[PDB]
Amino acid sequence: GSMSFIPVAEDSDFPIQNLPYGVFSTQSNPKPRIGVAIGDQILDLSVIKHLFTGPALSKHQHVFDETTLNNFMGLGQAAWKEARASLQNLLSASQARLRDDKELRQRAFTSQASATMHLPATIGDYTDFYSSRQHATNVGIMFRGKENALLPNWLHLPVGYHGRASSIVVSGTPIRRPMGQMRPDNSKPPVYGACRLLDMELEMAFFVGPGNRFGEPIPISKAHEHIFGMVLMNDWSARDIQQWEYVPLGPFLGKSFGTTISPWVVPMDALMPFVVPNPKQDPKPLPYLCHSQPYTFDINLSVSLKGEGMSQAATICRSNFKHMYWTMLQQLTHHSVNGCNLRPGDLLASGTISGSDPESFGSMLELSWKGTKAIDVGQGQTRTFLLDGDEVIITGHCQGDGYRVGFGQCAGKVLPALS
Amino acid sequence: MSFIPVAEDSDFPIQNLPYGVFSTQSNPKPRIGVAIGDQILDLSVIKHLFTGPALSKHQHVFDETTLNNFMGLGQAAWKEARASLQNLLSASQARLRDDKELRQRAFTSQASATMHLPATIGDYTDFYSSRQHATNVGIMFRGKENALLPNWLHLPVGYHGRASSIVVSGTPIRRPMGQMRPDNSKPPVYGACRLLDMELEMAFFVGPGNRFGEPIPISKAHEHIFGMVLMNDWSARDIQQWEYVPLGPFLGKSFGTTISPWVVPMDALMPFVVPNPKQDPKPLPYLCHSQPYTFDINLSVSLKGEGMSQAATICRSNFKHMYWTMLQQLTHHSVNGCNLRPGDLLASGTISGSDPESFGSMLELSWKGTKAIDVGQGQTRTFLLDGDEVIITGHCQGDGYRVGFGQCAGKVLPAL
Numbered sequence: 001g002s003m004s005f006i007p008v009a010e011d012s013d014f015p016i017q018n019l020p021y022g023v024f025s026t027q028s029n030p031k032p033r034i035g036v037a038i039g040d041q042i043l044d045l046s047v048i049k050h051l052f053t054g055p056a057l058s059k060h061q062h063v064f065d066e067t068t069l070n071n072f073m074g075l076g077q078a079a080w081k082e083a084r085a086s087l088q089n090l091l092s093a094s095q096a097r098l099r100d101d102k103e104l105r106q107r108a109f110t111s112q113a114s115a116t117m118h119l120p121a122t123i124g125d126y127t128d129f130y131s132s133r134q135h136a137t138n139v140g141i142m143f144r145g146k147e148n149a150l151l152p153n154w155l156h157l158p159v160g161y162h163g164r165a166s167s168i169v170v171s172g173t174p175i176r177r178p179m180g181q182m183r184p185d186n187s188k189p190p191v192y193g194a195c196r197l198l199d200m201e202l203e204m205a206f207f208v209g210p211g212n213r214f215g216e217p218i219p220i221s222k223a224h225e226h227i228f229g230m231v232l233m234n235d236w237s238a239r240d241i242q243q244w245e246y247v248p249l250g251p252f253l254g255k256s257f258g259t260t261i262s263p264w265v266v267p268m269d270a271l272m273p274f275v276v277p278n279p280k281q282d283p284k285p286l287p288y289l290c291h292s293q294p295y296t297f298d299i300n301l302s303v304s305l306k307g308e309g310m311s312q313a314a315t316i317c318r319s320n321f322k323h324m325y326w327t328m329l330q331q332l333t334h335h336s337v338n339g340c341n342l343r344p345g346d347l348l349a350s351g352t353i354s355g356s357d358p359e360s361f362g363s364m365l366e367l368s369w370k371g372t373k374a375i376d377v378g379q380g381q382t383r384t385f386l387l388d389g390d391e392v393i394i395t396g397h398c399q400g401d402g403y404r405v406g407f408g409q410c411a412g413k414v415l416p417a418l419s
Numbered sequence: 420m421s422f423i424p425v426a427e428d429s430d431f432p433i434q435n436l437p438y439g440v441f442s443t444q445s446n447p448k449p450r451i452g453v454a455i456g457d458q459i460l461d462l463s464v465i466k467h468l469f470t471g472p473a474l475s476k477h478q479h480v481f482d483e484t485t486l487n488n489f490m491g492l493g494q495a496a497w498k499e500a501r502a503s504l505q506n507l508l509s510a511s512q513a514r515l516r517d518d519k520e521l522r523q524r525a526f527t528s529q530a531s532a533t534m535h536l537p538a539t540i541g542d543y544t545d546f547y548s549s550r551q552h553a554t555n556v557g558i559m560f561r562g563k564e565n566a567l568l569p570n571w572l573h574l575p576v577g578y579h580g581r582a583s584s585i586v587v588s589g590t591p592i593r594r595p596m597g598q599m600r601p602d603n604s605k606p607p608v609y610g611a612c613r614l615l616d617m618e619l620e621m622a623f624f625v626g627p628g629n630r631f632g633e634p635i636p637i638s639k640a641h642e643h644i645f646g647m648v649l650m651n652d653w654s655a656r657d658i659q660q661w662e663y664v665p666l667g668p669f670l671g672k673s674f675g676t677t678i679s680p681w682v683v684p685m686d687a688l689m690p691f692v693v694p695n696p697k698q699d700p701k702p703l704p705y706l707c708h709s710q711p712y713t714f715d716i717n718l719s720v721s722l723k724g725e726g727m728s729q730a731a732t733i734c735r736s737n738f739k740h741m742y743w744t745m746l747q748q749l750t751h752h753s754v755n756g757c758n759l760r761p762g763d764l765l766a767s768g769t770i771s772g773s774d775p776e777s778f779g780s781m782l783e784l785s786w787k788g789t790k791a792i793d794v795g796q797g798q799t800r801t802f803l804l805d806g807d808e809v810i811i812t813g814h815c816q817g818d819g820y821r822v823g824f825g826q827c828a829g830k831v832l833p834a835l
């Protein structure tokens with residue numbers, strides 16, 4: 001292992017092997033600013049930005065003074081690697097520079113318990129993919145039947161859609177049950193009212209680093225240069241609103257009332273120790289989507305649900321990011337193949353993550369099988385879809401020897417509709 | 420009228436006064452201007468002339484590089500700005516006319532200015548609200564019996580678009596590469612798209628947001644409509660067709676979407692308002708409004724190929740060919756608590772009337788590449804060729820004046 005001078009519990013999400021980036025403020029100082037999580041502390045990068053003296057960062061220390069991570073994300077991998085090496089040195093148990101500087105160390109650290117986290121970046125565009133084969137198969141079985149499950153394009157390209165950026169909110173933001181239009185009765189006109197089928201969707205998402213120029217694709221051999229790091233995501237959805245609206249132009253108001261992300265962006269370099277070979281694709285993708293670089297990650301994901309009267313949250317999903325059929329390299333490559341310009345801070349989400357076991361299905365649409373099965377949420381309590389007052393928390397971790405790379409929380413509680 | 424000379428057929432009389440973001444050779448910083456005649460009035464230079472109650476403590480919005488903060492101030496501020504501008508340009512408040520020093524810094528030629536996007540667009544949405552356009556697509560894709568899908572007459576169908584690839588008029592558009600499936604018995608192929616199209620639309624910018632979780636009631640929707648631009652939603656129909664079921668248009672649209680730079684304020688367009696089209700069935704109460712909010716705006720699309728000496732007009736249409744209003748679109752977009760933000764762009768959908776001369780895309784004008792479009796000088800089109808230039812224009816015709824929209828132009832570059 002590796003150790004910091006900051007005390008780190010063995011099961012901490014935030015050992016020296018992680019070092020995720022986030023935006024926080026405190027009761028002492030309301031300015032949103034950039035920090036790195038270590039143990040139960042935050043290292044304020046605006047305070048220590050003069051210690052980044054290397055070639056990539058010496059002229060660009062102002063990126064650590066910003067209220068968002070966009071400019072640091074836009075600097076690209078030489079800057080990311082330099083920052084990470086600098087932070088691994090400065091936080092090391094055996095390095096005196098920061099460790100023994102009592103006054104600097106005093107103003108550079110703050111407790112995570114005292115901090116308010118904010119969205120880590122200003123997200124210009126958010127895209128949601130559909131890349132978990134079991135998830136898409138489950139939706140197809142439910143909607144179309146066993147024989148017609150996957151549509152003809154699914155095995156040939158990473159299907160995805162443009163999402164709503166404005167309603168991406170940081171963990172802990174309450175989510176109001178949406179009103180909208182639904183058609184519960186096919187023999188009657190649609191109605192207006194509160195959603196009746198409110199759902200969570202277990203996803204992960206990555207932030208884009210340097211963009212590409214308008215009109216210039218990113219070749220798949222270079223896609224890994226544009227992926228900064230990852231967060232957990234809950235794509236909340238209103239299944240009745242979605243079902244009525246989505247043919248033919250896609251999910252819209254069924255998704256755009258709220259999408260939650262966790263605040264700590266785990267850099268790809270922290271996740272590389274947990275990379276595994278990519279799943280075999282058959283049919284083989286077209287050459288522009290073909291890559292040998294391993295880019296599938298062993299990340300254990302868990303979803304809990306706690307009703308408003310419960311004292312214990314129930315774990316309703318245990319899944320893993322390694323199941324996904326299309327990689328992040330393929331998603332990024334496909335997103336830019338037409339010349340579309342990805343920009344720093346854009347967010348590309350995986351799709352709902354389901355494995356083959358029903359215990360690993362990533363939505364309550366799947367876990368309840370379209371409301372036909374009860375989900376056990378603890379002694380004599382069941383769900384099909386979300387109730388008012390329910391809190392959903394997504395967590396994730398990679399497990400090393402004596403350490404984990406964890407993601408903190410992606411939480412939200414459902415508020416009653418305005419009706 | 421104004422002390423600035425305005426030619427009779429100008430797009431930009433004192434009745435228009437659209438807002439834009441421009442820069443010059445002398446000053447490369449993007450800044451806010453208003454078009455008048457063939458000049459631009461620089462609002463950063465004259466920001467101290469906005470002395471009324473809504474703007475006197477908020478003059479800094481005119482020093483920004485984008486219109487977002489002025490859009491975000493809301494309608495009292497917009498109305499005061501317009502009245503201030505009209506009084507300055509008529510010389511009823513004569514500071515600008517007679518202060519020669521200020522006047523020489525305040526006005527620059529449109530010809531010498533470079534236009535930029537008018538706002539930083541946080542989210543772009545494209546609707547599907549022209550009935551004849553949706554009907555035509557339905558006929559072509561599904562047959563005449565199943566032209567409209569069951570939801571179309573009940574809600575303003577739309578999808579989230581790509582904000583990053585919205586570009587200002589004049590930007591070259593590269594023909595996109597991507598996946599296509601020309602033969603359904605064989606695997607898809609990768610290559611240059613073959614069915615490159617233009618889509619005639621208009622779009623409006625959002626004013627003040629709504630808070631996350633708080634719908635905008637239809638009664639208040641008119642408070643959030645800042646102003647309008649022309650749009651060409653370029654598309655790759657063969658890429659679109661293969662990708663879009665079931666999650667919607669994606670790479671078929673996102674390689675490029677062009678808007679005109681001059682944002683015509685809604686108060687300029689109010690003289691041209693007409694009754695709303697009768698909706699049957701009547702929409703749910705959350706979508707109902709009595710206020711007229713349908714506009715008589717004449718739209719024209721020209722195409723000019725390589726070698727061709729003059730552009731051919733391939734479409735003449737009107738924004739009154741819309742079934743759902745902008746009020747309904749804005750209200751529907753926020754009914755679920757989605758938070759619209761200042762500078763968001765909500766586009767109408769492709770505009771088609773009943774006359775085939777008014778169909779707003781080459782998918783429709785060529786009827787899925789089965790009919791050749793006459794573009795003059797012996798030449799025909801189904802879809803766009805490399806080197807083709809498409810220019811959209813629009814105007815309202817008043818008595819003795821016109822409110823024009825400028826241009827929404829782009830030329831097709833060969834695939835890379």
Ligand SMILES: CP(=O)(O)CC(=O)CC(=O)O
Pocket residue numbers: 128129130131132135139201235237251350351352666
């Ligand atoms: C069909 P769906 O609701 O899963 C569409 C998506 O939102 C994509 C996904 O999460 O997998």
Ligand SMILES: CP(=O)(O)CC(=O)CC(=O)O
Pocket residue numbers: 249545546547548549552556618652654668767768769770
């Ligand atoms: C079917 P389509 O390509 O017209 C979908 C849209 O893009 C909406 C529209 O322009 O009307």
Ligand SMILES: [Ca+2]
Pocket residue numbers: 128201203235351352
């Ligand atoms: Ca989703």
Ligand SMILES: [Ca+2]
Pocket residue numbers: 545618620652768769
């Ligand atoms: Ca369109």
Ligand SMILES: [Mg+2]
Pocket residue numbers: 234235236237254255256257258259260
């Ligand atoms: Mg959502």
Ligand SMILES: [Mg+2]
Pocket residue numbers: 651652653654671672673674675676677
């Ligand atoms: Mg487009």
Ligand code: NI
Pocket residue numbers: 001002
């Ligand atoms: Ni070791």
